[PDB]
Each structure stands twice: as structure tokens, then as C-alpha cells.
Amino acid sequence: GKGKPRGLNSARKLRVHRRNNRWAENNYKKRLLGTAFKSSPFGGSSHAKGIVLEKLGIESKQPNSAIRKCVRVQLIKNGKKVTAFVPNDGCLNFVDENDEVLLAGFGRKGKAKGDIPGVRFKVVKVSGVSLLALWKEKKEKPRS
Amino acid sequence: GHKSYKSKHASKGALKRLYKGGKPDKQVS
Amino acid sequence: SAKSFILRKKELMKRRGRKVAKDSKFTGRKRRHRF
Amino acid sequence: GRMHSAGKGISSSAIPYSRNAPAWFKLSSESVIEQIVKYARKGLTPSQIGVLLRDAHGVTQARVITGNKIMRILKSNGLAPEIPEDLYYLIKKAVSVRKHLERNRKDKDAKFRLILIESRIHRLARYYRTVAVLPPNWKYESATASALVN
Amino acid sequence: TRSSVLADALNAINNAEKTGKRQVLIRPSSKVIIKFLQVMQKHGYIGEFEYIDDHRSGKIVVQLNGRLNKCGVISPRFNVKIGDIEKWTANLLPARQFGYVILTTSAGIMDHEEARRKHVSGKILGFVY
RNA sequence: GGAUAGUGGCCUACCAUGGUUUCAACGGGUAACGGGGAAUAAGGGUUCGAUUCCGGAGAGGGAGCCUGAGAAACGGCUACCACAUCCAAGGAAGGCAGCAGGCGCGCAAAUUACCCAAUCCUAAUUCAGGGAGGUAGUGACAAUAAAUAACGAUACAGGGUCUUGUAAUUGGAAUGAGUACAAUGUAAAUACCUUAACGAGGAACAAUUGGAGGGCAAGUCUGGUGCCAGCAGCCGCGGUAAUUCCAGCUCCAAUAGCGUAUAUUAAAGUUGUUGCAGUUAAAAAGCUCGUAGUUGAACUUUGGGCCCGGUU
RNA sequence: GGUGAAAUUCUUGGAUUUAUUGAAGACUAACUACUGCGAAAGCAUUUGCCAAGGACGUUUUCAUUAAUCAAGAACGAAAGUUAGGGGAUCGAAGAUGAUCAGAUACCGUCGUAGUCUUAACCAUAAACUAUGCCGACUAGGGAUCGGGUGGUGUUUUUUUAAUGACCCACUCGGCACCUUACGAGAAAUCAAAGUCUUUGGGUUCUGGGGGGAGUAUGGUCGCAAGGCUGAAACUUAAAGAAUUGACGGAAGGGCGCCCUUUGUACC
């Protein structure tokens, strides 16, 4: 029983049925439709670079407020315009418009640490130096 | 309470109640 | 809503029978600041 | 179970556990075979000959008394028909139900029954042309089947 | 239809051993079923089987003795090289010392350990422990 | 028959009407050179292979060709095509997917260095030539080994006369990271191996990176800030969808490395051949026939005796 | 007539109602069951004709002729489409009325298509046992349908023989049921949903979190309605089985307060 062919000479049916089934996966279908090369905002890339369009104050709530905001950036190689969560406070005095930031992915979303509705990108570098050293006062952002 | 009628894609009658109330594709070489 | 989530979800483990460290002014905050 | 039905019956015959010599028979072997060939000289099929020799003359089964099958006996004397008996009866039933279907056009269950009978006929004809009893095509079809059966 | 009579025979043995009966009646018989039960009896996992001979296919009646956990068939009869026969026992035997998987080789129908001893392999037929 | 080095529809004349296909032909996609291999360790598998070896193709796109044993060669030619150089305006010269390097594209990648000394190749040939190749510079791709401290005495705390812990207490020892006579090393140098001499008293010669409700290891820590139609009254308390608003102390893990992003693999039995499920959680065609496909009852030399020699 | 109430409606040419008779088309109550038949949808008056089936019985015949099934084919509830026929009832659409706080009592009357049949189309349903088909084994019991076997068993012959019907025992094949857990399962529950981490009898189909979405596009079938096949970007951490209760304006008692029974989401 058990639904499937089990005969010694029925390998062709097993292969074809498995091929259609594997097409009904998710990782496999994303890999062979090649949407990382056609529909993904990054070109299948891990990091990317972009020119900062503008910045918008997507704030949690009103006067009693937790200040976690995001920028609007435009990619260079693709031209698609996305949103990026800048790290810890005070760095928006550091990044302005048109600074050629370097972006990555964000990661997990749980109860905390950023539950922003539809922001999967974090600004890793700004002006081609960093955010960590430029927040820990190791290096300084050069002018233009 | 009644158990809700279960289906994957919504039934045609409920589709009627909800709805009442071009160019070809591309294949780049 | 870190305080409400943690204080609600640390009581369910008390019913399930597991140890939970007692709360103070150190639990519901950014323990580590971001970049 | 049945080939084209939902039934699962087992009504059949059970051949006795004896390969020789009914004690009270004690009659002959050649008298039996001349009765067989004379009954076939009337023009009866092997099954009716078997049931008559069982019902009238004490022949239990012809495989043990004569040592040979009935159809092989008729083949030995050249009385074997052009088509075998089961295919002949299937063709006759198909002809009758078809005639009913030209007479009564709306009878859908009879259409389904005709389809069942013709699938049975095609399967049996495939078996016969496999074992080289029929001509290797033999081509059952609607019309000449009437001229085939009678 | 009865595609594998060895499967139905071993399934009847398994059911009647699990429910605790003393005798098992098996229909139809075969050369392969007879050899399988000689393997079982020579290893002692069953009792005493006697073959009732009518002209159709025969029947078997076997005396069980307990002492038998599970027997079954592997279907289809996979071609089994000797270099991976250990894989097969590591697939479905509880331990490495007891329990037997049964092979049909050109030297006959025989359990796995004397298949090591004779250094001959073949098709896999079933298992018993 | 022509042609080829040679068989051959490779080409031509004549004459037949054939060849492939559900065992999926033909067409399309490939961000596809193929393989030896690589990552993932219960087995089976999933994913990758532009890349140190082997085979193929190409020198900006096509085509043609000379020489020659070997080329449809490009560090050879001719022609067109796309770029594009020098000017005396008439004409001439071009091909870095060789080595360096530059521009551009980008998340993404080194010196316009030295040498034929090694490995080998070419030639008229031990001798010449070789950005083939070797050496060095840049180099936290990856991989191996292990310095940042060790031993006492004192005074206490102990386990309690034998054994540990603390101290703005004290003592001499030991040595490489570096600085370098020299010599090895090398085509010549740099570096390693060796070593005359110098080189440790902590802000010395100072180790970081992540974290601290649970996963999952470590806070019944500290301080400051914005607000309150709530108490008090100018001291303050508490609360603060502040998703902690900001900093410090202490602790945990890993450690010359640590974190992050993406992709993939395992734990995953969410691809299930091993090994999934289908009454109600996703999922049994409305029903039957039927072609290819898959699968298909039992039965034919068994049993017994003989010897011999092989392994424990 | 009609409703909780009214109105539209018919009527002194007599409405409603009683009786006699006729005409039409549709459907076969009660018998009607935890019963039968059919591949399923489905099938209920009598008789006749035609062909077909299943089970049982068989000391008949062939000797593997079979099981499941992409392509392909037949049928397929109701609804719907094109001509013809018929048009009693019911009746989408439509016409008219009261619209009276509440309709907890959102309706009344008339009424086209349809409902019925012929000759053609369409091929879908909660088409459901929400349980593919074939084969094997595993547990007690009582009923019931069809066939068969045995009874110096019962009853009706007008003399007690056949048959019919009933009773007892058995057997084959069914539709169903009560209990159990040897076993299974997440649980409700299951003689199969058992013989499964001790996992392999044969074989078709289908599913891979929820939305987007049965959408868009392509192809094909269809006169139409529509059917068959059918993605993606994007977005999200969510979306079956039981028990348990706050809550009660559930009610019933007592002597405003207590005690018992009581059912626990869509828009």
C-alpha cells in the first residue's frame, strides 16, 4: 500500500512524481524561478550600496515616544527605492541626504529590538566608513 | 455555535456575496 | 510593550513548572544598546 | 470479485480429490467418446455436452474418464467451431443488446452494459490472438459481427 | 489479486502470534514459503509445520511455540550486493547479534549470516526475529 | 560521380519515401563550459564545481586565406562591422579574456618590483631566450603551533600542626615582542633557524568582540532625564504602549580573534526510496470503462549412501 | 381570503360552502424499516413487451485469459441555453399594499422564464462514508434481506402425500447495528481509521503555513452562461479535538439577600 509505486521497475514514475512535488516546495521554486535576479530589490546580493533619497520619521507613537526612525534610500546598481532602519539614536544627525550608504539585511523580529512594519534593511556604512566606529567616536565622517 | 464551512479557496456562493457587496505575459530571451 | 509581554510570559512558565529569575529594574529594557 | 461489478461471490464447483476411476461407473472409455462426438454431431458446444454426460450417463467429468479434455476431443475429430465458445456467446449477447439499442435509443444503462460487454470481448480477443487461435488481427467491429455470429 | 503469497503467509503468522493462537493455517503454499519456514524452524523461531496436499496449491499448518517477535517480507526483492548487506541489517534489525534477514541467492534460500559464510549474495526476501 | 588525408548526403546528378516520438521527439529556459572533485558525517541524500589537473572553445563580432608536418593562427594577413589613434588633410597604424597597471562597473579582489638560481620549454643548441615560472612587496580568503605573566617571604582569612584565598606589603629570578655586531639563509637581498650587546615593575610591553526575562550562561545592580487634571508641597513618592530615554558598575561566553548580512547544508521524517500525510488539521478525481506504464496463482532433481581432503 | 394588526383582493350577475358530472397536467401518501436495487447521479401504482445484472447451486467449459490505470470514451442531481409540444400546481424576474415603535409575528395577491416531454447542448454540487480500487488475517452477540442444505418440527390440502407459509440448526453473499480494546489515534472516535519508529502485498490520484488567488496570462472545450489547466511580485507569525469556568436580565425555591438547575462567534 502506502500510495506510491513500490515495484522494482518503476523508477521513472518516482522521479517524475518527485519532480512535480519538489516544484511544490518553496526554496526550490525560488531558486529555479530565479527571482533573486529579477524581482528581488538587491540583485541577489548580501550587501548593497545606495544614495539616500530622504528621511521620514516613522515613530512608534505620540508624546510618550520611543524614537526609532528610518530613512528612504535609492539603490545604485538597480535603481529600486527601499527603506532602511538606521541604528541607535543620534545617527540621523550623522547621516543626511545623498551620503552613499552601504546596506545589509536586518534579521529577526520578535517582541522587541525593532518591529518596524516592512523594513528589512539596516544601514551598515555611511559615507564609506562605518556606523559603529562613527558612533563609538573612533573615526569621523568626512565632509561630502 | 455552528462549525464554519472549511475550504482552501473561497466558495463560489461566498464569492458572489463578497463581489456583489489584457496584455500577454513576457518570456525574455 | 516589553514589560507587559515579559511579565505575562514569565507567569506561564510558573504554571508549566520551570525556574524564572525574579523581576527588578533590569529586565524590560535595552540591555545592549544598538549601533 | 467480478470483473465489471461490485460483487464478490464464490458460487462455483469443487472438483473432487480423486484423479481416477469412479467405482460404480465401470462402463467404458470409447463409448463415452463416441457419445461425445455424436452429441457434437447434433451441433452442441462442449459445455452442454459436459452437462448432458453428467446428467444422463453417469460421466462424472470427462477429464478423468477419457483422460482427455472435451475441446481437445472435438479438435481431434475436427468438430471444433471457427471461434471459441465464450467469445461466440459474448458476441451473441453483444449483438442482441445492440439490436435493443437501435430499437430503444434512450436506454443509457444498456449503453453502459454494451460498453462493458465490448470491453470484455476486446480483452478476450486480445487473449486469443496472443495464443494464436484467431487470425492475428480478427478485427471485431459492429456490423459484420452479426454475420460473424450466425 | 494475491501478488505475494509469502507476504500474506507471514502476515497471517504475525497476526496469529500477536493474538496468541497455537496453530496457523496458511494458503496458498509455495516452494519459497516452504523454504522460508525451514529457515525459521532450523533457527527454531516456529514449531512444526505439516503440508496438507490437495491438488490445487496445498495448505500449511504450523505449530507455533511463542518465542517469535516479528517476521515480515521485504518487497520488491531488491538486488543486494554483498558489500552493502550490512546496511540492510543495520536498517531493520534490533541488534547486531540476533535477528536474521533472509536472502535468496543462487545457492538457495538462506539467512544472512551463512550468506556471509558462503560469501554469496542475491536478492532480499524477508526478515525474522 | 566530385572532393577530402581518408569512410561517410560532406557535396552534385538520378531514383526511391523514408527517419525520430509518452521509454517525452521537436521547441524553449539555463544568472549551463564538462569531468576528476567540494561542503554537509547515523546511512541514504541535498547543494556547489568561473578556479592550481584532464578534455573543449575563444582572442572586440563574422567570414576568407598565405606559409607550414601541424592554424581557419589573431603578440600572421585580407575584407566588411563596432569602437578608436597620428598628423603637414595628402596618407598611416590598431586588438591586454598574457604579465604589471589604468578607467569603468560594482558588496566584491594585489607591485607599471627582482631574476632565469630552481621546474621545464624552444633553437643551429651545455652557453642564448622565456611576465612559462621562481623570489619579494600588498594580503585577518582559508589553515597549523601558542606570549600578555611565574615563584617565594610577611600580615590576616580560612580548610586547620599540613593546605588554599586576600593585601595601594616585600624579594630576587626567567625570557621574548622589539633594537641589532656577526654568520647562516638568497641569483642578489627581506624574512625564518642561531646569537655578542641592550631590552618588565604595571596609566609597564595596558586584548578585544559580543551578550546578561526564556531559548541560552550570566544582575532580588547604580545614576540621570521628558510627562502626570494621582498623592505631597518645592523635599519628594509612584506610574510613566518612554516598544525603556540615556550612561556607569558587576557578571557570562569565545578569544588573536569576534560579530553581522546573504546563500547553502544538518538538526527536518516540511520532499519522505530508506522515511510523510489525505474522516474532522492542506490534501481520494462525481462515477465507470480503457491504451501505454507498473504489478501478477501453484507446479518440473528431491532425498539417500560413498570416500577423500580444507578451516577452527 | 389574509396577518400579531390592517390593506390590495372576490361577492346580493350569490363570494366562501354542500352535492352531481366533466376536462387538463403533474405526483404516486399511509405500507415506508436503521430494508432492497443500481458504477454513480438515482430508483416507489397495475399489466404487457424488450434486453441486462447480482447472489446461490453445479463431480459443466477455457487454463492465467488478471489488478490498478496518463491518452481516450460513456453516463452524470438541480440550475442554465436553441427550436417544437404542453401549460394544473408551485414559482426567480416583474406589478401592486400596508409599511402599524417590534415583526421577537419583515409579509399579501397576481405572475413571465422555469417546473413536464421531444431532438440537441453544458459536465458542476456539503456529487459526502467529507474514508480510491484489488487481495490477506485478526472478536463476541443478536436481528434482517437473497440463495442453498437437513429436521419419523408446526400449520393449510379435504385426508393429510408435493408445494406455499412459519419454527430449529448450518452455510454463502449483502445492507445495518450493540459491546469491547487484543491493537490504533491529537481527541472525538475506529472490526477498520488494526496488522506502522518492531516503519516494505499490488497500484492510481492529491497536499507542503495563511493571504494575494482559483486572481492575471496562455491554451483548450462551450452559441451563451461558463468549464478544464493555472502562477508570481508583495505581505504576514500565525491560521483541528475535547474539558473547564467568570457571565447571566436561564428559571425555580427561600426570608433587598442567599441556595439549586442552566447555555457559554458572524456581520
Short mmCIF file of C-alpha atoms in Angstrom, two decimals, chain A residues 9-142:
data_model
loop_
_atom_site.label_atom_id
_atom_site.label_comp_id
_atom_site.label_asym_id
_atom_site.label_seq_id
_atom_site.Cartn_x
_atom_site.Cartn_y
_atom_site.Cartn_z
CA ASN A 9 10.99 -1.21 -12.37
CA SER A 10 9.02 1.93 -11.53
CA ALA A 11 11.83 4.45 -11.04
CA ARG A 12 10.60 6.73 -13.85
CA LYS A 13 7.26 7.31 -12.13
CA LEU A 14 9.07 8.01 -8.86
CA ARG A 15 11.39 10.57 -10.48
CA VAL A 16 8.64 12.44 -12.33
CA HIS A 17 6.29 12.49 -9.33
CA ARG A 18 9.16 13.70 -7.12
CA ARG A 19 10.00 16.42 -9.64
CA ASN A 20 6.48 17.87 -9.58
CA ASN A 21 6.41 17.57 -5.78
CA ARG A 22 9.73 19.39 -5.42
CA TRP A 23 8.30 22.07 -7.67
CA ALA A 24 5.64 22.48 -4.99
CA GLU A 25 8.37 23.38 -2.44
CA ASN A 26 9.38 26.92 -1.61
CA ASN A 27 13.19 27.10 -1.55
CA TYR A 28 13.42 25.08 -4.78
CA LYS A 29 10.86 27.21 -6.63
CA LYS A 30 12.51 30.47 -5.52
CA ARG A 31 15.84 29.09 -6.74
CA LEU A 32 14.67 27.97 -10.19
CA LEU A 33 12.33 30.83 -10.97
CA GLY A 34 15.40 33.00 -10.31
CA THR A 35 13.54 35.77 -8.51
CA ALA A 36 16.79 36.73 -6.78
CA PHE A 37 17.93 38.03 -10.17
CA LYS A 38 14.68 39.52 -11.47
CA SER A 39 12.33 40.53 -8.65
CA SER A 40 14.46 40.90 -5.52
CA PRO A 41 15.43 44.50 -4.65
CA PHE A 42 19.02 43.52 -4.10
CA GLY A 43 20.41 41.73 -7.12
CA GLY A 44 20.72 38.53 -5.13
CA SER A 45 23.42 40.34 -3.18
CA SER A 46 24.19 40.25 0.53
CA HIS A 47 25.11 43.92 0.99
CA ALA A 48 24.49 46.78 -1.40
CA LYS A 49 25.12 50.50 -1.82
CA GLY A 50 22.61 53.29 -2.19
CA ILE A 51 22.17 57.04 -2.36
CA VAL A 52 19.93 58.45 0.36
CA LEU A 53 16.75 59.94 -1.07
CA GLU A 54 15.20 61.36 2.08
CA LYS A 55 14.33 60.50 5.68
CA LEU A 56 10.92 60.06 7.30
CA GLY A 57 10.06 59.93 10.97
CA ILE A 58 8.26 56.60 11.31
CA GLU A 59 7.70 56.89 15.04
CA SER A 60 6.22 54.31 17.43
CA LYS A 61 3.60 56.61 18.99
CA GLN A 62 2.68 60.08 20.36
CA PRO A 63 4.12 62.24 23.07
CA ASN A 64 5.34 59.37 25.26
CA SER A 65 7.57 58.17 22.47
CA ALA A 66 10.32 55.67 21.73
CA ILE A 67 12.40 57.23 18.98
CA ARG A 68 13.28 54.58 16.32
CA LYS A 69 13.24 56.04 12.80
CA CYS A 70 14.14 55.01 9.25
CA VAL A 71 15.48 56.51 6.02
CA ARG A 72 14.36 56.20 2.39
CA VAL A 73 17.24 55.25 0.09
CA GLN A 74 17.68 54.53 -3.62
CA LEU A 75 19.91 51.70 -4.82
CA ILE A 76 22.71 52.40 -7.27
CA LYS A 77 23.01 49.28 -9.43
CA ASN A 78 19.28 48.59 -9.64
CA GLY A 79 17.53 51.90 -9.03
CA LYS A 80 14.83 50.42 -6.80
CA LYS A 81 13.88 52.62 -3.85
CA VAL A 82 13.66 51.00 -0.41
CA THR A 83 13.51 51.82 3.30
CA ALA A 84 16.32 51.25 5.80
CA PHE A 85 16.34 51.17 9.59
CA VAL A 86 19.22 53.30 10.85
CA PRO A 87 20.80 52.01 14.08
CA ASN A 88 20.89 53.63 17.54
CA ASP A 89 19.84 57.18 18.33
CA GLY A 90 21.70 60.32 17.26
CA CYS A 91 22.97 58.86 14.00
CA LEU A 92 20.49 60.84 11.91
CA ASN A 93 22.49 63.92 12.84
CA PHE A 94 25.34 61.97 11.24
CA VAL A 95 23.68 60.74 8.03
CA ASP A 96 21.96 63.28 5.80
CA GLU A 97 20.58 63.14 2.27
CA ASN A 98 22.91 61.94 -0.51
CA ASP A 99 25.60 60.16 1.50
CA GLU A 100 26.01 56.79 -0.33
CA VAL A 101 25.25 54.40 2.50
CA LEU A 102 26.02 50.68 2.42
CA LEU A 103 23.05 48.46 3.32
CA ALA A 104 22.56 44.92 4.58
CA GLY A 105 19.70 42.73 5.77
CA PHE A 106 18.08 43.17 9.14
CA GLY A 107 17.42 39.80 10.75
CA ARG A 108 14.93 38.62 13.36
CA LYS A 109 11.79 40.33 14.65
CA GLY A 110 10.37 39.20 17.98
CA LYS A 111 8.85 41.12 20.89
CA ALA A 112 11.35 43.96 20.64
CA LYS A 113 14.61 45.24 19.01
CA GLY A 114 12.73 46.68 16.05
CA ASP A 115 9.30 45.50 14.93
CA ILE A 116 9.03 48.04 12.10
CA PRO A 117 6.24 47.24 9.55
CA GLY A 118 8.25 46.35 6.46
CA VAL A 119 11.88 47.35 6.97
CA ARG A 120 14.39 44.56 6.35
CA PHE A 121 17.47 46.72 5.67
CA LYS A 122 19.92 48.27 8.13
CA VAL A 123 22.49 50.91 7.24
CA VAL A 124 25.86 49.26 7.89
CA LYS A 125 28.10 52.01 6.49
CA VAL A 126 27.63 55.72 5.81
CA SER A 127 29.96 57.84 3.62
CA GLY A 128 32.08 54.73 3.14
CA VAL A 129 33.40 54.44 6.68
CA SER A 130 31.05 52.80 9.28
CA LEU A 131 28.29 53.32 11.79
CA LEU A 132 29.96 51.53 14.71
CA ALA A 133 33.22 53.49 14.74
CA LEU A 134 31.34 56.64 13.77
CA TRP A 135 29.09 56.12 16.81
CA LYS A 136 31.86 54.95 19.16
CA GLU A 137 33.82 58.13 18.22
CA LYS A 138 36.73 56.19 16.72
CA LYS A 139 36.56 57.65 13.20
CA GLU A 140 34.86 60.82 11.99
CA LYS A 141 32.64 61.34 8.96
CA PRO A 142 34.47 63.29 6.22
#
